[PDB]
């Protein structure tokens, strides 16, 4: 201001949701109503080997929530919104699990066509990593991280493991690992003091050390594309810090598979750099809800529809 002392603040981060934020009908309002968004949607349609747009808009096969489909659907919706927005001037970005790929497209690490192929393979490898019934995930609500981690250490036994996977906000920690231990937690969660332990609709033990089984296949595929440096820092899920290096970001995308999503620490790191406005771009406002529980003073904007794009523009 007029004192010549500009407070740390006024930085803005654009952020992107992942699995769990999809909805049938997503992006149907953009298609053929905005040229930039439609370029992205038609790119995804021409690139993918299934009918991504039918799957997003009407999902007559009820497969939108199967992660091999949901991942490219979410990337496509967030990127289509992003392409339609004018003078979005982010200082940083982050995204939740799949959402980090939307950050990579936003920061020009990856082109949209390279990223949509990459996340389709990421979804197919995750979906096929373990047979039905071997690994799963559950949301533990109402407990501090230290208590959830203790519980996980107690139940991990007999060569089976359960680990904190998605560290979302105070009172919401998703855990992941062998299904027998996930189901024991589901059964005993109330007695252990959790407000609610919700088993989740997932095909495997995502973001647990068990996902090392797909590291090699994923590293091999991602070498088929050119990765670039980021134009502004991507706060990565593995380490909760801003990264711009192409080789550091690429290596962290492979580690991301089998490492917990550090959403609380990434949110905190961004606020400690002076981010006071987060703009969520995608279907739903799930990350805005998590950030509100992390810090109630920062500003939250959600961009979900063509009308929200018009209002911003
Ligand atoms: Ca990854």
Curated annotation (Swiss-Prot):
Record's superkingdom? Bacteria
Has UniProt tagged this entry with the keyword Acyltransferase?
yes
Kindly list the cysteine pairs connected by disulfide bridges: none
- Matching Gene3D superfamilies, A to Z? Malonyl-CoA ACP transacylase, ACP-binding (3.30.70.250), Malonyl-Coenzyme A Acyl Carrier Protein, domain 2 (3.40.366.10)
Q: Which residues form the active site?
A: 97, 207
User: A Pfam family for this UniProt protein?
Assistant: Acyl_transf_1
UniProt entry tagged with the keyword Nucleus: no
What keywords is this UniProt entry annotated with?
A: Acyltransferase, Fatty acid biosynthesis, Fatty acid metabolism, Lipid biosynthesis, Lipid metabolism, Transferase
Entry EC number(s): 2.3.1.39
Offer a single GO CC term for the protein. cytosol
According to its UniProt record, which reaction does this protein catalyse?
A: holo-[ACP] + malonyl-CoA = malonyl-[ACP] + CoA
Q: What is this protein called?
A: Malonyl CoA-acyl carrier protein transacylase
Its transmembrane ranges are none
Gene Ontology MF terms in the entry: [acyl-carrier-protein] S-malonyltransferase activity
Q: Which GO terms describe its biological process?
A: fatty acid biosynthetic process
Annotated pathway: Lipid metabolism; fatty acid biosynthesis
